[PDB]
Design a protein around this ligand. Structure first.
Ligand SMILES: C[C@H]1O[C@@H](n2cc(I)c3c(N)ncnc32)[C@H](O)[C@@H]1O
Length: 343
């Protein structure tokens, strides 16, 4: 009972390159066992050697993309319920992301170009740890003026009731996010964002805080919420207290009161609203051991967005979130390599 393009999302279309590595690999690059960061010059060499020295696998990624795909799955109903914009290169990986996007029934529209190659994210695994390093490359080429502003494209944005952009995109195009954010405000549409990662509150506060007055629902996990409190000067490590001060932040559109939503891995999820702060136990999806916390976070938001779009109550939105988060589990050792290597 929801028409197409009801949910709009845009972000960094990335291809995840994952493999189990050794502590000598993490140290060569001075990485932390469990973390997320953008590639610097000292990392260029980390991608070549990852694929040459280890048993890597390829999965269409990009945080916001993943949510969009999870959401559309939950929606199921009309295909192309969820929209997604982003920049890719004109190459192999590019072709794959588009394909994986069609099979998701997502109404994807990418800005394709030849200068930069499709972007990737390395997921260097060690035991139960996951160290992510993104090489945005092409995902970093997004310009509103040359895509989001085009009428056929901006037209699809005008159809959505809910918009979602992971904060990851703030490092790429704050201008694009603002335009979308400002539009939700003026037309009383729902504008949602993610704290994405600690680095977003550390080195992008300016773009984030400029966008925050337009955020109707904020998402993020414990570590992102702790970093956000510390950089904003909250003076408190208490998650529920953080959710509360975050919910009171200056808001542009008074018609909607802010909602903050913080996932805690296996611990309770925390929702703060003008009224109160409440905790929600996660599904007894025990014995799950090898469970991508990050991927879990993304699927949570997708579940939550799936219901939110049709005005379900918040508790129902959270319920869907927890469900998606239990089911949609990526795993290592699943696919077969495309070409042998026998010799
Ligand atoms: C776990 C998911 O998180 C995504 N992820 C990790 C990083 I660092 C990152 C960035 N900068 N942008 C968009 N999506 C991102 C990754 O590609 C997986 O799909």
């Amino acid at each position: 009972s929801v028409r197409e393009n009801i949910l709009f999302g845009m972000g960094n279309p990335l291809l995840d390159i994952s493999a189990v590595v050794d502590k000598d690999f993490l140290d060569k690059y001075s990485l932390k066992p469990n973390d997320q960061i953008l590639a610097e010059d000292k990392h260029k060499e980390l991608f070549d050697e990852l694929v040459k020295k280890f048993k890597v696998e390829y999965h269409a990624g990009g945080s916001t993309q993943n949510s969009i795909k999870v959401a559309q799955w939950m929606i199921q109903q009309p295909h192309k319920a969820a929209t997604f914009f982003g920049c890719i290169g004109i190459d192999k990986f590019g072709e794959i992301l588009k394909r994986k996007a069609a099979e998701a029934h997502v109404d994807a529209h990418y800005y394709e170009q030849n200068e930069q190659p499709t972007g990737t994210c390395a997921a260097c695994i060690t035991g139960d740890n996951r160290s992510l390093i993104a090489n945005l490359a092409a995902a970093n080429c997004y310009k509103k003026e040359k895509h989001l502003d085009l009428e056929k494209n901006w037209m699809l944005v005008e159809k959505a009731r809910v918009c979602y952009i992971a904060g990851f995109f703030l490092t790429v195009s704050p201008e694009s996010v603002l335009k979308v954010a400002h539009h939700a405000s003026e037309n009383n549409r729902i504008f949602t964002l993610n704290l994405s990662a600690p680095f977003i509150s550390q080195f992008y506060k300016e773009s984030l805080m400029k966008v925050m007055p337009y955020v109707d629902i904020l998402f993020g996990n414990e570590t992102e919420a702790a970093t956000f409190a510390r950089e904003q000067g909250f003076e408190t490590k208490d998650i529920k207290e953080i959710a509360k001060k975050t919910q009171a932040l200056p808001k542009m559109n008074s018609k909607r009161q802010r909602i903050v939503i913080f996932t805690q891995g296996r611990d309770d999820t925390i929702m703060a609203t003008e009224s109160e702060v409440t905790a929600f136990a996660v599904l007894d999806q025990d014995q799950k051991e090898i469970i991508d916390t990050n991927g879990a976070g993304d699927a949570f938001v997708g579940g939550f967005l799936s219901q939110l779009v049709s005005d379900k109550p918040l508790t129902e939105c959270i319920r869907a979130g927890h469900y998606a988060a239990s089911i949609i589990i990526r795993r290592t050792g699943c696919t077969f390599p495309e070409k042998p290597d026998f010799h």
